[PDB]
Amino acid sequence: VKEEIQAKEYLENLNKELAKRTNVETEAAWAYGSNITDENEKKKNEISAELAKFMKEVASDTTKFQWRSYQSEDLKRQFKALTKLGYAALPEDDYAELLDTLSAMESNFAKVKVCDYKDSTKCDLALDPEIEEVISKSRDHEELAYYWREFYDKAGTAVRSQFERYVELNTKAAKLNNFTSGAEAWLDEYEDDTFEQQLEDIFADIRPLYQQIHGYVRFRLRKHYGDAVVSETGPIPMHLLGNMWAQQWSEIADIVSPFPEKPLVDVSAEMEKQGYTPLKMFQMGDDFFTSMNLTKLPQDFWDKSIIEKPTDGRDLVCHASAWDFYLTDDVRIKQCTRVTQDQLFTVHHELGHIQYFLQYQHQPFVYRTGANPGFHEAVGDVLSLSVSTPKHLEKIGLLKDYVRDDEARINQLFLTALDKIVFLPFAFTMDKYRWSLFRGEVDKANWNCAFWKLRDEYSGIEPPVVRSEKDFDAPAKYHISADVEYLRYLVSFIIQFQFYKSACIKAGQYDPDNVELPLDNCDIYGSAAAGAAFHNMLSMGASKPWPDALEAFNGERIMSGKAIAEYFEPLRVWLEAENIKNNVHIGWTTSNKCVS
Ligand SMILES: *[C@@H]1O[C@H](CO)[C@@H](O[C@@H]2O[C@H](CO)[C@@H](O[C@@H]3O[C@H](CO[C@H]4O[C@H](CO)[C@@H](O)[C@H](O)[C@@H]4O)[C@@H](O)[C@H](O[C@H]4O[C@H](CO[C@@H]5O[C@H](CO)[C@@H](O)[C@H](O)[C@@H]5O)[C@@H](O)[C@H](O)[C@@H]4O)[C@@H]3O)[C@H](O)[C@H]2NC(C)=O)[C@H](O)[C@H]1NC(C)=O
Ligand SMILES: *[C@@H]1O[C@H](CO)[C@@H](O)[C@H](O)[C@H]1NC(C)=O
Ligand SMILES: *[C@@H]1O[C@H](CO)[C@@H](O)[C@H](O)[C@H]1NC(C)=O
Ligand SMILES: C=C(C[SeH])C(=O)N1CCC[C@H]1C(=O)O
Ligand SMILES: [Zn+2]
């Protein structure tokens, strides 16, 4: 009770100390991600080991405080965050091995190089950008399969043994914190003992819509490739979906769009024609934020960021990332930026993270993070939703001669759906798979097909060629080799529509009883009211539980699929009718593609 006065001073000092200590770990991590070398790996891992040691002392020292006895919700909440040790709870030697494993994987992934399909001499092709360019633009189904195979063999199957040890150590670490496994560890970040159920329920409401999109896309792909490549009743061969992991299908919109003779938005060629640069694209992102009365990017951002792929022979992690350094105004992005419409969305996504950093940088160290991981992921996407509208793309002069009729509107809704709906069953399987390994629910002899079973069951997709337990495929996705929780993205795609809906209403850009203000053509650019709400929420960091953060934004406390259903309602109506009209088969048979 009266001990709380001394405890407050303890927290003030320790918070500031953790910030300064993390800053050093973060610089070392940045160094590695920007320049992968044996020497920089050593540094990175050794620094983190040192910080883990300090963390162990900190968790120990908290037991000197009767902190659960305290009056202040705020002090109790801060102390609680400090007891949460993570991997740091592992014994010295164990933590060292974990770190060496994580970087062995993350590095292997970033170092992947395949040979040219047309030329077995030219073997310096990397995922970003050589391979991803083919996956997104080639319509030679056999070339597509070739690249799919080479990549998965190298980014997935090579790190099997490493991944095995990683699950062991994650599990051990989780138990040392008295969680059942890493699943329950990850899920703790959401402060809600029913969070899993809530998601199952939401997915359940959304699933039928996904089913229809799946059916229609399969139908259209059959006309393009033939029935020899695409069956009517089988899962879709994933390598035809424009994307290496088939998480989003917007890259093949030119062949599966509802009205092929009406405008389909693809501003990449205009960006190039108008001489866009990575630097331009970021400056535009900056403009969007400042136009909403949010915070200008600081000078440290422009000085220290990496916004193009470096042209020395160096290895590096090209997967887009945003870094907070826990001082004042030292925030950065690393992105291997290309001049395309999707990349413009990515830029806004990453600047969403940066804005979050800046908004809560005045918070105590333990509150300098998302309300929950999903929130951090949503921020950028809320703006990207606006940026993607014809309304906005016409404004910045990238969309020309556009006629917004009923048919064009459907093409746009479908395009967004190939991004926003398609993704959801992907996001789920990502952690569903890992959760099941963490919880020890799959025998090691079953690990790979247990992956593809989930991809089948939820997404209705399957590998181009036959896989087995001789292959190991999950780490072919970045966030799996790099040990990054994925449920964040699912939470994001649900709640980003709650944010966007309410942002649009506050901007006077959405009225449901008004045909001239439709949610799917809302641009919040320049809205002070919208930015205001963002500020109220983002400036909180993790100071209160996420319910209180959402309440701050728009007065609501519940994660809901209502808003994302509201957005796509007009597409549902059209697509249900269209599938009936064309006698489109819905659903899929079990996949013959992973042998046990
Ligand atoms: C993971 O979950 C674990 C639960 O399984 C948990 O492990 C337990 O942590 C306990 C620490 O809180 C620890 O409890 C201590 O046990 C000592 C004796 O245990 C020994 O013999 C056991 C066999 O019988 C062995 O298995 C053990 O290895 C030990 O060798 C006790 O002597 C000790 O006591 C002291 O501390 C209490 C604390 O008092 C609290 O604070 C104030 C005092 O300042 C009190 O006023 C207040 O009321 C409050 O109770 C004192 O009361 C007492 O006088 C002694 O000073 C203590 O009970 C336990 O041993 C340990 N393991 C097991 C198997 O139980 C981990 O902590 C969890 N990890 C995380 C991250 O939470
Ligand atoms: C990468 O790190 C190495 C040492 O590991 C160093 O010699 C080199 O200068 C760095 N390269 C770049 C481009 O910074
Ligand atoms: C900008 O933000 C300030 C405080 O954050 C607020 O008072 C002001 O209304 C905002 N600007 C506009 C034009 O609304
Ligand atoms: C570029 C990012 C932001 Se860290 C990313 O990883 N994204 C953007 C949305 C989900 C996802 C992905 O790669 O799968
Ligand atoms: Zn992100």
Residue numbers in the entry: 19 to 614
From the reporting publication:
Human angiotensin I-converting enzyme (ACE; EC3.4.15.1) is a zinc metallopeptidase that plays a critical role in blood pressure regulation by catalysing the proteolysis of angiotensin I to the vasopressor angiotensin II. Because selenium compounds are known to exhibit better antioxidant behaviour than their sulfur analogues, we have recently reported the synthesis, characterization and antioxidant activity of a number of selenium analogues of the clinically used ACE inhibitor captopril. It was shown that selenium analogues of captopril (SeCap) not only inhibit ACE activity, but also can effectively scavenge peroxynitrite, a strong oxidant found in vivo. Here, we report for the first time, structural details on the binding of one of the potent SeCaps to tACE and AnCE, as elucidated by X-ray crystallography at 2.4 and 2.35 Å resolution, respectively. Captopril is one of the smallest ACE inhibitors and with both ACE and AnCE, key interactions of the selenium analogue's central carbonyl and proline carboxylate anchor the inhibitor in the cavernous S1′S2′-binding site of the enzyme.
